[PDB]
Amino acid sequence: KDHLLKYNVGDLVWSKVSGYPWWPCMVSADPLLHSYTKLKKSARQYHVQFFGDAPERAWIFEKSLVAFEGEGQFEKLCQESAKQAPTKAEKIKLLKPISGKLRAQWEMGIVQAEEAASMSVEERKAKFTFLY
């Protein structure tokens, strides 16, 4: 059913998790379930790996994903998420630039994602699929 789906394994995406900035990810298979997409059964989720020195993984709703082209998208993603926010505290935090450990890790993720973007889907799957 790959053709009916917005993303496939190896596609680079930005993911939005509450309390975190938009983060560079790669759509991948769940190491235990062996699936990359599912219905939580009307809304679609995708399994993603978060790039960086301390990688993580999650099932994310399609509405919290944006196709990754590059770092230049980040500014508009922050602005759009801020305008879409209900609470004033949420808006303020979204536009506040990342700092410390998290900023360094986000930058490491970008570096990894940009290398992955320059490769074919097959090549990046082989190189950037973090085992679990």
Residue with smaller CB distance to ligand Q5D, 10 or 109: 109
Which class for 99: exposed (0-12), middle (13-18), buried (19 or more C-beta within 10 A)? Answer: exposed
Q: Pattern 86-125, binding to ligand Q5D, x per CB under 6 A?
A: -------------------x--xx----------------
Is 20 a binder of ligand Q5D (CB under 6 A)? yes
Is 56 a binder of ligand Q5D (CB under 6 A)? yes
C-alpha distances in Å from residue 73, one per residue of 68, 85, 113 = 8, 19, 13
Helix and strand totals (H; E) in the chain:
4, 6
Residue with smaller CB distance to ligand Q5D, 53 or 80: 53
Is 23 a binder of ligand Q5D (CB under 6 A)? yes
